[PDB]
């Protein structure tokens, strides 16, 4: 099972570790090389009460995944628009974790005052694209080959959903 709670400083290590476990597959992150906790300390502390980072613990209390809400643009005009990022420990892939995490993210979002929620997913990540599309997200954009890794170009798709009635 999985239980969500607000992230804490001592979680940074596990959060980065999960992030790094996904780099190899080059299916969700824009990094080709593993990063260090120090390289992400800013991003980590950058979360707020309205745009938080949540971690999900397995039945053993170990952080197995996380959900991050981030600002779209540091401008009041975009205050009700946010990005949602979900990373799962590569070792937990293929267990239905994604579905549960997205559902929780969506339950939480409205209470954060978020009206429009967007997700940045690589064009070749069909599983993630299908998951979001089953939950009300539509493709709002496709930025062709703007990501380059291993000498290959990748497309970035932007999926969005308006939550507010």
From Swiss-Prot:
This entry's Gene Ontology molecular function terms read: acyltransferase activity, transferring groups other than amino-acyl groups; phosphinothricin N-acetyltransferase activity
Protein's UniProt keywords contain Acyltransferase:
yes
| Catalytic EC class | transferase
UniProt cross-references to InterPro entries, sorted A to Z? Acyl_CoA_acyltransferase, GNAT_dom
Protein's UniProt keywords contain Transferase: yes
- Annotated coiled-coil positions are none
Which residues of the sequence carry a binding annotation for acetyl-CoA?
Answer: 86-88, 95-99, 125-127
Query: Its Gene Ontology biological processes?
Result: response to antibiotic; response to herbicide
Q: What is its EC number?
A: 2.3.1.183
- CDD domains found in the cross-reference section: NAT_SF
Q: Output the Pfam families linked to this UniProt entry.
A: Acetyltransf_1
N-acetyltransferase domain location: 3-159
Recite the UniProt keywords alphabetically: Acyltransferase, Antibiotic resistance, Herbicide resistance, Transferase
Q: Which reaction does it catalyse?
A: phosphinothricin + acetyl-CoA = N-acetylphosphinothricin + CoA + H(+)
Q: SUPFAM superfamilies annotated for this entry? A: Acyl-CoA N-acyltransferases (Nat)
Q: Which PANTHER family match?
A: N-ACETYLTRANSFERASE, UPF0039 PROTEIN C11D3.02C
Family note: Belongs to the acetyltransferase family. PAT/BAR subfamily.
Protein task: This enzyme is an effector of phosphinothricin tripeptide (PTT or bialaphos) resistance. Inactivates PTT by transfer of an acetyl group.
Query: Which named protein is this?
Result: Putative phosphinothricin acetyltransferase YwnH
Organism classification: Bacteria, Bacillati, Bacillota, Bacilli, Bacillales
This chain is encoded by the gene named ywnH
